[PDB]
Amino acid sequence: KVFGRCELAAAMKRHGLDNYRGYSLGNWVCAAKFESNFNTQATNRNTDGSTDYGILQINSRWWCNDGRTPGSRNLCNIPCSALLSSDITASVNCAKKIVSDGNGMNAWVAWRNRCKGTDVQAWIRGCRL
Ligand SMILES: [Cl-]
Ligand code: NA
Numbered sequence: 001k002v003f004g005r006c007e008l009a010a011a012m013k014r015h016g017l018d019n020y021r022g023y024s025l026g027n028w029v030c031a032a033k034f035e036s037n038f039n040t041q042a043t044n045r046n047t048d049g050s051t052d053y054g055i056l057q058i059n060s061r062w063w064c065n066d067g068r069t070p071g072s073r074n075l076c077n078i079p080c081s082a083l084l085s086s087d088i089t090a091s092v093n094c095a096k097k098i099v100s101d102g103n104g105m106n107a108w109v110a111w112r113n114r115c116k117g118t119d120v121q122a123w124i125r126g127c128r129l
Contacts, residue, residue: 003038006127026120034110054083085103
């Protein structure tokens with residue numbers, strides 16, 4: 001599923017990501033835009049051999065099991081394929097663990113380099129939330 005911008009905003013709000021650990025909703029929409037272009041099926045291989053999965057590009061080294069990453073910790077206790085669903089519940093649950101791990105949203109490279117320090121409220125402009 002390729003989400004619309006406000007469609008994704010409403011789903012993330014439903015799941016409690018608005019100001020989760022202090023990160024306003026626009027931060028989460030911005031991250032999804034630049035990590036996956038709002039596409040739940042996105043996958044990208046990293047140089048270290050791990051792969052990033054789903055709308056928030058959650059990484060197989062630490063967070064999910066994809067059967068082909070040495071040393072996988074699988075801390076969200078899910079198969080990485082579960083992150084590609086049109087239902088974003090699994091991705092959101094796992095993202096809550098990640099952002100609570102100590103570095104906040106800096107865990108998402110695209111957030112750090114493209115959202116941090118910008119007017120992220122623009123990502124929810126026009127949305128009825
Ligand atoms: Cl933080
Ligand atoms: Na893992």
